[PDB]
Point group: C3
Chain length 347, copies 3
């Protein structure tokens, strides 16, 4: 970020990036130009000695389609908050679900990974989400250096019309009822971290009536993760079991799913950072005769070269291990490999 | 506003806010998350001793729906202008109709009130409007302290297609023909003020042919206002009489309406600002047998706590006095109560 | 531009403008409020003595319609790049096609001209374009001052669905296959040439009625005089299957000509006269040879300073109303533009 304002206790950071990005793939819905930019602001205001106020906005602007194309920009984050010294912080708005407090440890691939793979955005509390109220406490009230926990509540984001509607309605794959989540992370050793996260949300009428797959009044996630980040080495894994909460492509939700991500990286001092990872999502108890199915399965190999802190370039190669079957065909799940080439200017 | 540039006679302010906001209501179309943000730029350039140029843009970005949702951002203001000392200023673009020069005096509720209630945006010269040319004069050419006036013209904003079209066409509720408006305000003492505004607009063909309610070739408004703003006390009222200009929800326009708003507030030293308000809009001579109908009617009780100039929080309680009847149902007018809670970061 | 950050090898420039703009015309799809704003950021970071990285983003935000209108903002430019000494520069993203390296010389009118007239945006490599990789060299490796050249590649931007699709599919009028282009300019008189050749897509040969062929080509030569308060410029372009025939398709062949003359007075006034035409040949469905564009332009800009200007522009449209202009949606009416512009 670039601090563009700092005066009389108030600070404003402007940040973002421009990613000149191209995908190569036999999947024609993935292939071609993928250039986009992000822009955001982070602001902080000193209220008194024990109270600081803050806000953050993050905006995604696609730049790979035409000037007449529709819906090419959207807000990723918009929240306002208060920080009460060592008693914690509280914020409300569009923010990350606290499950990401753990799964973010494997969201480090050169290009792929993260939301869109084993979980999505607007997908209960697994990633970015509307209407989340988040209490956080770092180093447990100042007692325990390295122990962090979060408690989070989300109100219902319902259908567009009818009985289950809210003002901000959306389709069933992005709906949620009232829900809550919790996370806990700790520095178990020098450079080694362990984390656990839990979420429980009500499902909506349309999730239990419109798609073919997935039935249940509640969505639940359980997550455990490990991270090692020292001596130029980064290793991380996350394992998550979900109920009625992992998407089964366009067909609905998986009544149960088991998701696993693991990644290994090395940082060379001259700027090169090679990366290898493996990601899978196994759905279980699927209706309509599908039974157990692979929702995602691939090996990732790539590398980033950091020219400096404001410029980088990368290659990323998704080695897709899914087979073509009637589930992947009916759910719209991609089974082809992808190669990505990126050149990134960051401010 | 944060001044981020001031050099060689040109200066640029970046301003805006992030409002983590939630509505509670039995009305499903307003209940739920309402988080949004605003960002704007204000610029001015000294041209010579008697002439300054300026420009301003204000953008609204909703953050309460998903990243795939449509139409989540829009321009509230965009205009350029010239200021010639005592002889006045002139600007053109998307700006406030001069009726709001007076009706803004009651637009001070913690959350509710303002446009959307007794008047709307893109609603002739009553609020933000496309294509307004505005001449303004402060202190009557420098000769009468506290005496301000404005003259304004607006070109036709017509239909999407057909004989009544313009390039920037829209639906009947937000169309207008050629029109003009005037405003005048007088600061008797530094806080105490009286104001008047007038506007007159050609109506468009679709305003008479498409909706069921409201017929006439001309839209007119007459507004008077009073304000007391001193000694930590704020009192304000406005009364407006419209002809063919006040929307009757989705049913069309009211042939005549009488609108009234009044607000009482007190500013405590430690930051709390309680607020009480009453608002009503009475439609008259409506077609299809509706006769006289209330379009808006509620009492508002709330409060804002100002942590400082960059952070605030508020509660606002709209106690709705409308009856659930045939007019309100067919017009899509809300008759339920609403509670708003908000946490605001401001730059 | 406004330099809002400059620290430790890293610079950020913020730029843009707010244009309070009104059109007067008998053409109702053109007449009325046209107010809009542009905002953009230009950044650059010093990597080492020879290597600089950069990026630029330019956004267009319409302000002439309501707060519930659709599709009112879009990205004009977004690219990242590397600059290495006299070896040149390389960037990738949404950027200008190298044909505009020469046709930009006539894109100097007070309001009209430029994309939308003899060429469009997202129109192979004639203007702003998705997915362009652009190599540029200034002063021929530092050996010849004023000699500039550019080499450019564009990947396919295909249909929304079917086997001709890409992730970023669009309609046939804004599709392209793989393409390349090159530009050459030599510098107060300058001469320029540009060439581009792209594959066409299958929806371009099946969906619209006009224009057929596997390849789109453009050839451009231009001339510019810019000194002694005088600006004169001309460009002539021949295209094949590359110029739009309104909403009807493409012209199998087109000849485009633009020429402009302006003078800058010391107190601020910049009068301007221009002529633009686009002649389409060999059109199907009985259209044959048709005028696609034909007008004379007269206007003037007054600059108050570098941050504020105002202008008037008069398009005197010479197109005749006929079956082609009507079915294609081409305007044959005159337009008057009045604008007041704050720039940062
Ligand atoms: C105070 C100023 C009152 C002005 C006032 O009368 O407010 C309006 C009445 O509404 C309310 O009931 C408004 C009620 C507002 C409550 C004010 C009392 C608060 C006391 C503390 C005026 O309506 P109008 O169309 O002119 O009358 C026509 C007819 O006689 C209206 O009946
Ligand atoms: C602090 C500003 C908003 C407060 C958070 C909203 C609380 C969420 O409530 C969910 C609705 O359920 C009742
Ligand atoms: C013009 C394009 O040339 C870019 C070449 O950059 C060479 C990269 O060299 C290695 C990176 O070292 C910089 C840190
Ligand atoms: C320079 C800004 C443009 C101002 C022109 C006024 C447009 C209003 O006229 C409407 C049609 O008559
Ligand atoms: C000075 O000219 C402006 C006149 O002010 C308008 C007053 O009319 C409003 C009365 O309803
Ligand atoms: C050069 O002067 C430009 C003339 O301005 C346009 C005049 O046309 C207005 C009505 O046709
Ligand atoms: C119906 C499709 C399933 C949900 C995804 C769409 C939600 N929405 C409208 C924001 O896109
Ligand atoms: C009814 C008219 C509403 C205005 C149309 N609009 C602006 C929403 O497109
Ligand atoms: C036909 C070409 C129009 C381009 C399509 N789209 C959606 C980008 O506008």
């Amino acid at each position: 970020g670039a601090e563009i304002y700092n005066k009389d206790g108030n600070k404003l950071d402007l940040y973002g990036k421009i990613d000149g990005l191209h995908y190569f793939s036999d999947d024609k819905s993935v292939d071609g130009d993928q250039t986009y930019m992000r822009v955001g602001v982070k602001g902080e205001t000193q209220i008194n000695d024990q109270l600081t106020g803050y806000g953050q906005w993050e905006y995604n602007v696609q730049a790979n389609n035409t000037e007449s194309s529709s819906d090419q920009a959207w807000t990723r984050l918009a929240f306002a908050g208060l920080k009460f010294g060592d008693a914690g912080s509280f914020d409300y708005g569009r923010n990350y679900g606290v499950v990401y407090d753990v799964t973010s440890w494997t969201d480090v691939l050169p290009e792929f990974g993260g939301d869109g793979d084993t979980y999505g955005s607007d997908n209960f509390l697994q990633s970015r989400a509307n209407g989340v109220a988040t209490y956080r406490n770092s180093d447990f009230f100042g007692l325990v250096d390295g122990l962090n926990f979060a408690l989070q509540y989300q109100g219902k984001n319902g259908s567009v019309s009818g009985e289950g509607a809210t003002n901000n309605g959306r389709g069933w794959s992005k709906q949620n009822g009232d829900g809550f989540g919790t996370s806990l992370t700790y520095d178990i050793w020098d450079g080694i971290s362990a984390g656990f996260a839990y979420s429980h949300s009500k499902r909506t009428d349309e999730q239990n009536s419109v798609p073919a797959l997935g039935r249940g009044d509640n969505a639940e996630t359980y997550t455990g993760g490990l991270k090692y980040d020292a001596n130029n080495i980064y290793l991380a894994s996350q394992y998550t079991q979900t109920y009625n909460a992992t998407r089964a492509g366009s067909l609905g939700f998986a009544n149960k799913a088991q998701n696993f991500e693991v990644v290994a990286q090395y940082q060379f001092d001259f700027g090169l950072r090679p990366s290898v990872a493996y990601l899978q999502s196994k759905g279980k108890d699927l209706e309509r005769g599908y039974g157990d199915q692979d929702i995602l399965k691939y090996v990732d190999v790539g590398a980033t070269y950091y020219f400096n802190k404001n410029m980088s370039t990368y290659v990323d190669y998704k080695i897709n291990l899914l087979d073509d079957n009637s589930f992947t065909r009916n759910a719209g799940i991609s089974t082809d490999d992808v190669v990505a080439l990126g050149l990134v200017y960051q401010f």
